[PDB]
């Protein structure tokens with residue numbers, strides 16, 4: 001993935017993030033786990049935007065993955081970085097699993 005340089009929506013909620021994803025073009029890139037890893041769909045092309053670090057990201061290659069992309073381009077992301085956020089995750093255990101360790 002390349003990066004795009006620099007109701008009411010509670011886009012801190014994963015459910016709602018997930019809402020944004022109903023006109024989402026890329027059927028092989030799993031919007032669910034995109035929307036769980038911080039991102040909401042801007043609607044423009046294939047470009048998503050992270051609520052927590054403001055990273056933007058489009059041009060998804062057919063073997064890319066959501067977290068590693070998210071990490072590559074903005075690795076100091078509060079959410080990825082397992083800082084305190086206001087994220088409200090559908091399934092807290094699901095989030096934990098799919099976030100970079102720190103073993």
Ligand SMILES: [Zn+2]
Pocket residue numbers: 038050051052053054055070074077078079080
């Ligand atoms: Zn982020």
